[PDB]
Amino acid sequence: YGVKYTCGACAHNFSLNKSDPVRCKECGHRVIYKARTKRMSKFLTT
Amino acid sequence: SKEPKVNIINAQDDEVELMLSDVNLSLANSLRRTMLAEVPTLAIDLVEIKMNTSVLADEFISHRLGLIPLVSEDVEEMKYSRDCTCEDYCDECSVVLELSARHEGETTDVYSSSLIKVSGPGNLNVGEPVRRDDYDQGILLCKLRNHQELNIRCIAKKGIAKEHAKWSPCSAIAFEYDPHNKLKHTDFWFEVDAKKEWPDSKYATWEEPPKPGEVFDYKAKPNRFYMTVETTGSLKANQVFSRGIKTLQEKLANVLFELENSRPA
Amino acid sequence: MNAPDRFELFILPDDVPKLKITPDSRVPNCIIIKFEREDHTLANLLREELALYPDVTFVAYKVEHPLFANFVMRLQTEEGTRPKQALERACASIINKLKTLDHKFNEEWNIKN
Amino acid sequence: MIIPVRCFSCGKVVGDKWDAYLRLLEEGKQDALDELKLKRYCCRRMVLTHVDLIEKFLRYNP
Numbered sequence: 001y002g003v004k005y006t007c008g009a010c011a012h013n014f015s016l017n018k019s020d021p022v023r024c025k026e027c028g029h030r031v032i033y034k035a036r037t038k039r040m041s042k043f044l045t046t
Numbered sequence: 047s048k049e050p051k052v053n054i055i056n057a058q059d060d061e062v063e064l065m066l067s068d069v070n071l072s073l074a075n076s077l078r079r080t081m082l083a084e085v086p087t088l089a090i091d092l093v094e095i096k097m098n099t100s101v102l103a104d105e106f107i108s109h110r111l112g113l114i115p116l117v118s119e120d121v122e123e124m125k126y127s128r129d130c131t132c133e134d135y136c137d138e139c140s141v142v143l144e145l146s147a148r149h150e151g152e153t154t155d156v157y158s159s160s161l162i163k164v165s166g167p168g169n170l171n172v173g174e175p176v177r178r179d180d181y182d183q184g185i186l187l188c189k190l191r192n193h194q195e196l197n198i199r200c201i202a203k204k205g206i207a208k209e210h211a212k213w214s215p216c217s218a219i220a221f222e223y224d225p226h227n228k229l230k231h232t233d234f235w236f237e238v239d240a241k242k243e244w245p246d247s248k249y250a251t252w253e254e255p256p257k258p259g260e261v262f263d264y265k266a267k268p269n270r271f272y273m274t275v276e277t278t279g280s281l282k283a284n285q286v287f288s289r290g291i292k293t294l295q296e297k298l299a300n301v302l303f304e305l306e307n308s309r310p311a
Numbered sequence: 312m313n314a315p316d317r318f319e320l321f322i323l324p325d326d327v328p329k330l331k332i333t334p335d336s337r338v339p340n341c342i343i344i345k346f347e348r349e350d351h352t353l354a355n356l357l358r359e360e361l362a363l364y365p366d367v368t369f370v371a372y373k374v375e376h377p378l379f380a381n382f383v384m385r386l387q388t389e390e391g392t393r394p395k396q397a398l399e400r401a402c403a404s405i406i407n408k409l410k411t412l413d414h415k416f417n418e419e420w421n422i423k424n
Numbered sequence: 425m426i427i428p429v430r431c432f433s434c435g436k437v438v439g440d441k442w443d444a445y446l447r448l449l450e451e452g453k454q455d456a457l458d459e460l461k462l463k464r465y466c467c468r469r470m471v472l473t474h475v476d477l478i479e480k481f482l483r484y485n486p
């Protein structure tokens with residue numbers, strides 16, 4: 001349950017906020033994506 | 047028996063060759079297109095993706111499933127979501143499906159076979175991932191790697207080929223008539239000899255050749271048509287002809303019905 | 312962006328009759344029938360079966376423009392014979408022809424292995 | 425970029441037929457289309473022209 005940001009390589013759910021640095025629980029590589037939404041997305045079949 | 051008449055030739059499960067005689071082309075053609083476009087079917091229409099790590103995008107897969115052929119046998123005893131008195135959808139007018147795909151086998155594939163039928167079928171042939179594949183998993187939806195997941199939820203509905211191609215159960219239909227240009231509904235292109243340069247049709251053998259000595263017959267009309275009705279599944283090649291023959295009729299009906307509703311006043 | 316919703320090719324929209332019949336002033340005993348949400352599939356079929364009632368003096372039909380699924384049908388008949396009727400008849404003759412067809416295709420089928 | 429379900433042109437399904445084809449090549453060393461039941465060129469071109477990128481895409485990590 002719950003996830004905030006992910007890493008460009010070692011896709012490990014992180015989670016932060018201001019000043020808490022912008023790195024990862026290991027890999028220095030300071031990228032990070034902001035994982036999907038909770039509210040489902042609805043599509044059409046055409 | 048009566049008016050127009052059929053004379054089926056070699057027929058199978060995914061085709062129905064036959065000769066339709068004693069009918070006006072006008073009417074043959076009409077039936078032609080009716081199959082191609084207006085027979086009620088059943089296709090996925092709404093897709094509620096939850097998770098998806100596939101390399102394909104959401105709506106790309108969404109498209110895919112729209113095309114996956116579903117059962118449509120007792121499609122006629124279901125209602126168009128538009129007429130059903132339920133806000134959005136329900137068992138009485140839709141078929142819900144599930145799809146879960148976790149990459150475990152360190153290339154895992156997603157075949158249409160992998161679809162569940164979460165809603166109540168109410169005991170009627172419909173909503174089944176039409177599989178004709180040799181192994182047993184027709185239509186590869188998509189592939190995925192190591193830990194890529196993918197959770198959906200489909201909702202199928204009635205509809206027709208007009209509304210979308212994902213409906214029409216036809217898919218290609220042969221049509222020819224008077225292989226020997228006797229009616230002269232064509233002017234053959236040629237460099238020297240039309241006849242030698244233009245392929246003779248396999249259909250020329252169920253009608254008599256030209257015969258030189260005869261002048262040009264004029265009073266003759268387009269009678270008899272050699273066809274072939276291929277099917278994609280959903281509906282049995284036979285029905286994709288029957289139902290067609292019938293819907294065209296239902297329409298011709300209301301044109302007479304709508305008529306009546308206008309005489310009282 | 313600017314294209315209609317697909318379902319406009321068959322569903323009648325807010326208060327609209329499949330048929331709207333208008334008398335034609337150009338010539339006597341003539342009418343123009345506006346068919347809504349329809350096409351050649353049904354048009355040409357009706358047009359056809361009317362040159363069959365040799366009691367019909369005229370019968371052509373047309374699709375004003377392809378964006379809109381509608382079509383006009385103009386009919387003119389002999390003296391004191393209402394075309395609307397000839398439309399009924401020629402329309403009924405159509406169903407029978409098909410009724411027979413359906414049947415002749417079903418017995419025929421069963422005899423297959 | 426995956427196989428195209430149903431042929432654009434005529435409509436006949438063709439999703440399943442991918443593996444069958446890519447197989448009748450590698451092994452049976454073969455025409456393939458013809459037996460797979462792909463008659464008229466409309467659907468023919470469908471299979472005979474697909475360049476399955478998904479494979480390479482799949483070679484990517486997360």
Ligand SMILES: [Zn+2]
Nearest residue numbers: 007010024027
């Ligand atoms: Zn990291």
Ligand SMILES: [Zn+2]
Nearest residue numbers: 130132136139
């Ligand atoms: Zn409902």
Ligand SMILES: [Zn+2]
Nearest residue numbers: 431434466467
């Ligand atoms: Zn094709």
